[PDB]
Amino acid sequence: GSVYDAWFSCASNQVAQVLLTLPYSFSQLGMMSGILFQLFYGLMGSWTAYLISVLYVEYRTRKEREKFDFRNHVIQWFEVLDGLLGKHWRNLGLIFNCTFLLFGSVIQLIACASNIYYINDKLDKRTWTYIFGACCATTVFIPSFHNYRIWSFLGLAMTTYTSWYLTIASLLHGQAEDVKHSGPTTMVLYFTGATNILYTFGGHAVTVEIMHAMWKPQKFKAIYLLATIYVLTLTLPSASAVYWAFGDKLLTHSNALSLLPKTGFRDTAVILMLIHQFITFGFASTPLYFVWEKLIGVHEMFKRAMARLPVVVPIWFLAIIFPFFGPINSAVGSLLVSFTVYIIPALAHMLTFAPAPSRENAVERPPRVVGGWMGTYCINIFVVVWVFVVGFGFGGWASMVNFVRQIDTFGLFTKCYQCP
Numbered sequence: 001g002s003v004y005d006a007w008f009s010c011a012s013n014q015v016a017q018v019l020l021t022l023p024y025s026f027s028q029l030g031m032m033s034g035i036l037f038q039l040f041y042g043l044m045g046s047w048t049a050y051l052i053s054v055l056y057v058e059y060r061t062r063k064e065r066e067k068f069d070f071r072n073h074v075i076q077w078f079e080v081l082d083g084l085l086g087k088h089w090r091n092l093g094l095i096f097n098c099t100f101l102l103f104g105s106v107i108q109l110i111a112c113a114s115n116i117y118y119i120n121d122k123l124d125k126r127t128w129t130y131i132f133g134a135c136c137a138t139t140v141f142i143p144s145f146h147n148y149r150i151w152s153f154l155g156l157a158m159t160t161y162t163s164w165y166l167t168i169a170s171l172l173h174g175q176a177e178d179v180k181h182s183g184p185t186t187m188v189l190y191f192t193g194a195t196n197i198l199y200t201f202g203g204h205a206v207t208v209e210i211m212h213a214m215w216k217p218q219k220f221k222a223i224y225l226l227a228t229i230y231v232l233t234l235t236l237p238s239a240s241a242v243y244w245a246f247g248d249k250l251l252t253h254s255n256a257l258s259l260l261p262k263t264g265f266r267d268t269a270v271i272l273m274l275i276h277q278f279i280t281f282g283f284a285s286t287p288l289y290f291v292w293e294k295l296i297g298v299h300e301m302f303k304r305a306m307a308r309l310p311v312v313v314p315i316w317f318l319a320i321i322f323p324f325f326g327p328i329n330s331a332v333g334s335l336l337v338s339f340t341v342y343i344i345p346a347l348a349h350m351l352t353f354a355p356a357p358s359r360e361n362a363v364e365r366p367p368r369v370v371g372g373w374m375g376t377y378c379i380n381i382f383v384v385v386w387v388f389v390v391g392f393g394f395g396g397w398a399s400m401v402n403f404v405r406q407i408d409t410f411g412l413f414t415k416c417y418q419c420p
């Protein structure tokens, strides 16, 4: 409803599990490179979210001027792109967005399986993956997740507690005499960490879904920027402290909770993170469930809910076969996020306002602080070029080499991804 709910949603849906793999990224990038990449990608993700908001507002105004009703349904990103640029862009956006959301849900299932292992190690991470895959498949019966605001302003508290626990525990533990702090050793690890940060920031393809619930979506531009600033405040200290403490040992420990000594605070952090990803999975899979039902023609509950199972099976199977907690994030970030969250929105923004009449009669001009249309187009071109050459090319090469390396050394359907 109000702007506060939107801010909470943006701050809680921005980081779910990357808060635990961020120190692993730092162990590959180094302190300076990691900090610079997080800040640069935070700014770039805020910019892309602003572009997505501009496109959503433009589409909504273009439809209201024609007295379109929408029959009270969320205007999904593919619908906006269809109505604003054509059917080919509809297909492109739909495919990329749905694939990224499916892989993100897989990522949350893997994160839950990995996290629970550190409260109860009596069962291998694969058994935990089975159990939590069943628990997540239970979410099919839930129609939607937009209606809930508790799940936002509680998940933000859980993320804040986890980040501050990481920071304080790392600072108190202190680095041992045998610690080592090696910066960039090989470009593969460096670009894997950079791609993990890229995955961390950007919006996670849920911008329009966090925006439809707002009374006045025009303020989302600033709301998401402030939420990103708060998320940076959360992530920078935790990652920096965890790296400063356990430098060069995080390379083989993707999860940051595998290193810290077990205690009541660590158990609380694990429980809160599990409860946070159990809601992030739902908030990321509801969009997939809606599109699945729309394609199969079932969308208009037990009979309808049972029709959502074919969406769970790909998610449940993918988590089991590839439990690679850390490198999966880099792989998805380079292959899917680079297009889903950065390149595709920028290209859509450039094409939508390319025609002169469309640019002149737009709902709102870009801010003069960013140089108006000229500066907006320059920034969009830079974002596209950067996220392509580094996010996709170098990032894709490094992330896929690392993923194949994990497959080589641990195999498929591995019991432990890492239990040193």
Ligand SMILES: O=C(O)COc1ccc2ccccc2c1
Residues within 6 Å of the ligand: 013, 014, 015, 016, 017, 018, 019, 101, 104, 105, 107, 199, 200, 204, 205, 206, 280, 283, 284, 285
């Ligand atoms: O691991 C991370 O930082 C989080 O990733 C994601 C990815 C897609 C999402 C889609 C919807 C809601 C939350 C989402 C979180």
